[PDB]
Amino acid sequence: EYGAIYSVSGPVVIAENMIGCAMYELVKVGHDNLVGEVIRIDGDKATIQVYEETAGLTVGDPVLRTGKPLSVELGPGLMETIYDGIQRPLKAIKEESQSIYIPRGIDTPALDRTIKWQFTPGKFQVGDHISGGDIYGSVFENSLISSHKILLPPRSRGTITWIAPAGEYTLDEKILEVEFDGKKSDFTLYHTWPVRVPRPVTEKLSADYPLLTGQRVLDALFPCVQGGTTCIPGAFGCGKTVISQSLSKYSNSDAIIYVGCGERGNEMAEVLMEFPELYTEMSGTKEPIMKRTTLVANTSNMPVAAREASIYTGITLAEYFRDQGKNVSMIADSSSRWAEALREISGRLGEMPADQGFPAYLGAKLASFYERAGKAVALGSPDRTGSVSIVAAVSPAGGDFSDPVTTATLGITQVFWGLDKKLAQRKHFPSINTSVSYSKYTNVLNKFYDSNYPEFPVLRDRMKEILSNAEELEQVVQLVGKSALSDSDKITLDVATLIKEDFLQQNGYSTYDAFCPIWKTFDMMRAFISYHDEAQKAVANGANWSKLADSTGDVKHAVSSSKFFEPSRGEKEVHGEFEKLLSTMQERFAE
Amino acid sequence: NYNTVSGVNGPLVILEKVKFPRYNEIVNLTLPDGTVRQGQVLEIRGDRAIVQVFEGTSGIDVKKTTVEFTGESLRIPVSEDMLGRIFDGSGRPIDNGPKVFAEDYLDINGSPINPYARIYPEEMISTGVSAIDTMNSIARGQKIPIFSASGLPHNEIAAQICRQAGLVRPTKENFSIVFAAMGVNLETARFFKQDFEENGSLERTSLFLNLANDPTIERIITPRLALTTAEYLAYQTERHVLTILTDMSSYADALREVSAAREEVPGRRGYPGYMYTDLSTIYERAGRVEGRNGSITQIPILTMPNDDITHPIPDLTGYITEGQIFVDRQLHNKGIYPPINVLPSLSRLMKSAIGEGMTRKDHGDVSNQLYAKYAIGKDAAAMKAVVGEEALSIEDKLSLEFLEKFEKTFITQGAYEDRTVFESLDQAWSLLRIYPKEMLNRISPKILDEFYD
Amino acid sequence: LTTAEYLAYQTERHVLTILTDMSSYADALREVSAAREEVPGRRGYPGYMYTDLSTIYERAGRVEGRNGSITQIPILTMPNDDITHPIPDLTGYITEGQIFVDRQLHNKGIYPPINVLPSLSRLMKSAIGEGMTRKDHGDVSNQLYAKYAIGKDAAAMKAVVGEEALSIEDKLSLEFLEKFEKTFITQGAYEDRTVFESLDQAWSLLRIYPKEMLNRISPKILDEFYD
Secondary structure, eight states: OEEEEOOOOTTEEEEEOOTSSOOEEEEETTTEEEEEEEEETTTTEEEEEEESSSSTOOOEEEEEESOOOEEEETTTTTOOEEEEEEEEHHHHHHHOOOSSSOOOOOOSSSSSSSSEEEEEEOOTTOOOEEOOOOEEEEOSSSSOOOOOEEEESSOOOOOEEEEEOOOOOOOSSEEEEEETEEEEEEEOOOOEEESSSSEEEEEOOOSOOOOSSHHHHHHHSOOOOOOOOEEOOOOSSHHHHHHHHHHHSSSSSSSEEEEEEOHHHHHHHHHHHHHOBBBSSSSSOOOBBTTTTTTOOOOOTTTHHHTTTTHEEEHHHHHHHHHOOOOOEEEOOOHHHHHHHHHHHHHHTTOOOOOOOTTTTTTHHHHHHHOOOOOEESSTOOEEEEEEEEEEEEOOSSSSSSSSHHHHHHHHHHHOOOOOHHHTTTSSSSSSOOOOOOSSSSHHHHHHHHHHSSSOOOHHHHHHHHHHHHHHHHHTTTTTOSSSSSSHHHHHHHHHIIIIIIISSOOSSSTTTTTEEEHHHHHHHHHHHHHHHHHHHHTTTOOOOHHHHTTTTTHHHHHHHGSSSOOTTTTTHHHHHHHHHHHHHHHHTOO | OOOOOOOSSSSEEEEEOOOOTTEEEEEEOOTTSSSEEEEEEEEEEEEEEEESSSSOOOOOSSOOOEEEEEEHHHHOOSSSSSEEEEEEEESSBSOOOOOOOOEEOOOTTTTOOOOOTOOOOSSOOOOSSSTTTTSSSSOOOOOOOOOTTTSSSSSHHHHHHHHHHHHHHHGOOOEEEEEEEEEEEHHHHHHHHHHHHTTTTTTOOOOOEETTTSHHHHHHHHHHHHHHHHHIIIISSOOOOOOEOOOOHHHHHHHHHHHHHHOOOOOOOSSOOOHHHHHHHHHHTOOEEEOOEEEEEEEEEEEEGGOOTSHHHHHHHHHSSSSSSEOOHHHSOOOOOSSOOOOBBOOOSSSSSSTTTSSOOSHHHHHHHHHHHHHHHHHHHHHHHHTTTSSSSSSHHHHHHHHHIIIIHHHHHOSSOOHHHHHHHHHHHHHTTTSSSSOOOSSSSHHHHOOOO | OOHHHHHIIHHHHHHHHEOOOHHHHHHHHHHHTTTTTOOTTTSOOOOOOHHHHHTGGGGOOOTTTTTOEEEEEOOOOOGGOOTTHHHHHHHHHSSSSOOOOOOHHHHHTTTTOTTTTOOOOGGTTTSTTTSSSTTHHHHHHEEEEEEEEHHHHHHHHHHHHHTTTTTTTHHHHHHHHIIIIIIIIIOOOSSSHHHHHHHHHHHHHHHSOOSSTTTTSSSHHHHHHHO
């Protein structure tokens, strides 16, 4: 039944004859059909909360209700397309309306209906048993990734009747006619899924498959597997953007879904301008990073509902890509903005706050957002394996861990890698605290890495113990003195100082240090461990510390150069250098 | 069955054209989309009724929804076939097994044990831990909690407890436990699953698992199902019943969520005002019944927010349950085996299992003396850290080395390694032997002459 | 705001926005929010204040394809001389950088009291350099700021052990602090000095220290500037 606004108080508007509509349901208010959301419902008069401007909406204007909740369009035409908090293109809005401002109440499709695509039936015929997730065809979408698999939408099971494949069609065209127990039914290449409901899968699993960060320290200390969860600080000017972009470009995941909550205009504009500038490095040179990825941007002026729930839409799209059987990753910028917007939404819903101005559903929403990710097997005949790696940043107002955002971020994410501004102010590489860095995925990742015989865990824990002993030595150096220690302490301190330069630090500006392969980092840690062990063995061989430090300089200079010279195809070349380190031991048996 | 519905606001429901509704009555809600969601009645006034939806009011039509009201109170299909099979927070099978045949239909609310019918705590048990033996004793059938912090090895240490429980207890017929999770993590779910599988008790134990992905109502109802199940095991089944409940923090925050969703007048720290009694619902259910075989031993696990032991969650936990076993973040980052805080941790009945006739007469006095040496060692540690190493007394350094050794040796044994109570008493006598003759003022002359080799 | 908006997207001209007494506008917004008879939030302020400021400070920026740009620099009084104030906390994470006021510098009978520690701007990276402001801008700014900071540390240290214990960098920072405070800090009431006058006065005032006394200076800059 068509609704009619009988009351308007501020942003909230109550409309009668809305009994047909449901709770938490989207609606078009006023004669302009402005975007809105239904909050409560009393009989035939439902109370709706408009996310847009309430100005211009008057009495007597028929309000049409969607009768369902907020959703998004998954399918072809989605990739290489920028979107807003409301899941709307800014570029297409500026191209169509040709205006520098965005009107309130305007509406446009998320996916382009003006884009024709060439589709072809892959593994689905007429009469074959298929279900939700089962591949109904294949159509080339991006210029980077392989043809996007168009599958029969969820809750649809039957025998195929009329197939429109192969052929050229748009996103508004039905690519299949399925015959179910409900007789004749229509299915298209494009689908629509609720933003509040995560994408359905066949079976859930734990992620033992490690994701390559491309950074040495990121993959070594606090590694995040594909499907895994990782957290960091959202401090501006702390160089979070560089680490984020380097992570997105060097990611081992197939796709990346970037979702911002809110921020200053300069940051959002800088990201918006610098996004498409990245180029691919797979097949020589494919398309830009913006083509095989999805972007949802919402500024501070955007609605709060388009903030706290934007992460839900982005995660819905990422899980939709994870429903297609491809490993993906979800990046979230300034989650504290979605949390504060959730606080304002808490003030708007009348829900009594819990602590520090946080809503009641705090723990529930955080856990729901953190548990939607992971590596699993999607539903359907396809039986393809997929993953979704959640990566979040929390930027509390006071910076205190007592804030809801901080406790929730530390609690939900099983892996926490801290970014200290002082560490970036130390004239070093990407900022990470050596003391506060921790991850709970160490056991499973270590046991899984034993399959490929790539064992970091031994050298990781060893270098950790070395960094700790060096930390105690540093605490002692500021207490008594630096000249009063033993030989082992000096070797540990020197190894710690050396590890912070040629090992841990990797410049993304260089060729070989931009993305460090598993073999590169493993060989670096192996060579470092070989040098430290050779020094420790030489300490018991009767060699002087000064003479050793002077003679073994070549081994250090050779080990420091293992971070360059591009491609790691010749890792054995490093092994010889390691042997040279052993030769230093032979040099320590002479002088 | 009334097909008439009136209003919907947030996560709740209101119906009309009905009468004689029951408090906390089971009600089946059939939505417009065909979705069948279970719900409980909130209040009833005249021809109007108000109920709460477990699955939420999301995606539900007002006039197109139908509802069948059973009218009976909260009802669960309890049986003897629950052992070895896994159940979800919603009661539905998560083990992908067939329909479970119910032996008896009983209220999940649980019935308070009559005081005269209540039997006093007795005997003893071996948890495989020296701290679960020496410092704070654990009676069989008694109720003691575990207070941990977020990120700490709560699940792993608890796993050590559940794994070493039935193995060590016989040294004081295998022990049967019950696993319960309310709004818990998938990672913790996998860890607990692998733990219960490794213990091999999965066949002899039952599991009620409510995922965090599931609703809050299911998490709050999981504890009730576990209460009725453990009650049926400790009374009807007449077997030794261990009760393991986890993620009390999630149930607490969810309780605050339900309390705020009704916009009710909140108490301290935003929780419910009936919280003392709400926790006491499943808390006071533990104990022994005179004349009836078996008992229900409650070993709950909760997580203090921001690792704060002064938090209202832990305060209310101590105010509800009697005694608790603390897990400190201070000793968890020290790298030693599982981090029990000697100060905060205490037992409900530590005098029941001590003395001759139970275990030995060398237990309790040694506990008081060791606790004294440890505390004196802590104060002396602060004093030593303040003034200096040459500024502290002899007792200061002696108690310091004694506490350090007590932490490195006595406190550190192992998770999969279950230390017998006798080994605990021997290692304790050897730890106390490190101290001087005049060191222990809490010990008797006979025990002092006996313990020294 | 609409007035500044008309001279940017339509009229296409360079604009600058300035808001005075945002605290009074906050109390006014408090009465206006109470006009809906809603129960106020913490310390008598609306919970939607984040969005209220979000529709305000978002009126500044540069537009693509439009020559005219609008810049805004608001002003607000911190409550009871406290940075914990809801106003300061709201504009803190929202706006880029903050210009504070030192009550000590205003009550000492000196010029504009912006504390050098607290003074910061996020767009300072794009507003300096060759072709923007000057090549002597950023490095000498950091050097002067470091001189004032270390000068304050030396001010406290000399207030402890006395002036007889003054070290090289300590005394250098003492003179640098006294100078920067009584000269660099001093601007004027109606007085507006050019950026060139700023760079020149900066190099000249920092010239009091030797060439190696500043570790905040680059070699190329030191060779192409100092004269």
